[PDB]
Structure formats: C-alpha cells, structure tokens
Amino acid sequence: KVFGRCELAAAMKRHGLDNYRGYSLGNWVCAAKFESNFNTQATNRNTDGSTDYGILQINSRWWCNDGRTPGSRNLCNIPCSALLSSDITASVNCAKKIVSDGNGMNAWVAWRNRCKGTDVQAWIRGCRL
Ligand SMILES: [Cl-]
Ligand SMILES: [Cl-]
Numbered sequence: 392k393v394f395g396r397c398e399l400a401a402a403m404k405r406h407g408l409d410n411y412r413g414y415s416l417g418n419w420v421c422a423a424k425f426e427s428n429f430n431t432q433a434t435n436r437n438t439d440g441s442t443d444y445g446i447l448q449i450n451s452r453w454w455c456n457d458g459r460t461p462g463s464r465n466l467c468n469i470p471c472s473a474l475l476s477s478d479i480t481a482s483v484n485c486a487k488k489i490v491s492d493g494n495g496m497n498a499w500v501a502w503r504n505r506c507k508g509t510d511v512q513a514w515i516r517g518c519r520l
C-alpha cells in the first residue's frame with residue numbers, strides 16, 4: 392500500500408510512535424518518506440547482501456528473517472515479508488526495538504542524512520491528529 396502522508400501519521404500515532412524514545416511523530420513520518428516513499432512494499436538490496444523491507448526499510452542483517460542474509464539475526468522475530476503488509480503493526484513494533492538499541496533514529500541512515508535537524512514537524516502539517 393502507498394500510504395497518504397497524514398494517513399501514515401495517524402497510524403504511527405495510534406501505534407505509539409509519537410515521541411517514542413523522544414522522537415516526535417514528524418521524525419517518523421520523515422524517515423518513512425525518504426526510506427520507502429510511504430510504500431509498504433518497498434524492498435531495497437544493500438551492498439552487504441542484506442535487504443531493507445517496508446515503510447521504514449527495516450533491514451534483514453539484524454531485524455527480520457528473509458532466509459538469504461548470511462550470518463544474520465532476526466531480533467524482531469518476524470519474516471521480513473511481514474514488514475511489507477498494508478498493516479504497519481510488525482514494522483512499528485520492530486522500529487520500537489531498533490530505536491531503543493542505542494543510536495536512536497541514527498539507525499536509519501536516511502533519517503540521519505535527510506531528517507535530523509530539519510523542520511520535521513512539516514511532515515505532520517495539515518494532519519488532523
Ligand atoms: Cl513532529
Ligand atoms: Cl538469513
């Protein structure tokens with residue numbers, strides 16, 4: 392599914408990401424914009440042979456099992472394909488685990504490079520939340 396901006400903001404709030412580990416909602420919407428363009432079916436191969444999946448481009452090296460990432464872990468205990476669903480629940484519960492891990496949202500290179508320090512509140516402008 393390709394989420395609408397305000398549509399994703401509302402689902403992310405409802406699932407408890409607004410200010411999760413101190414990251415306001417616009418941070419999360421911003422990260423999804425630049426990771427997936429709001430498309431739950433986004434997949435992208437990394438140089439290390441791992442793959443990123445879903446609206447938040449959660450990676451198979453640590454976080455999900457795709458059966459084809461040597462030496463990998465599955466810390467969120469999910470098939471990577473569950474991150475592709477139009478239901479963002481597995482993605483959100485997995486993001487919560489990732490962002491508590493130490494480096495916060497820096498774990499999303501696109502967040503660090505494209506969202507961090509910007510007017511991320513713009514990503515939730517106009518939304519009834
Ligand atoms: Cl915000
Ligand atoms: Cl694997």
Ligand SMILES: [Cl-]
Nearest residue numbers: 412494495496
């Ligand atoms: Cl932090």
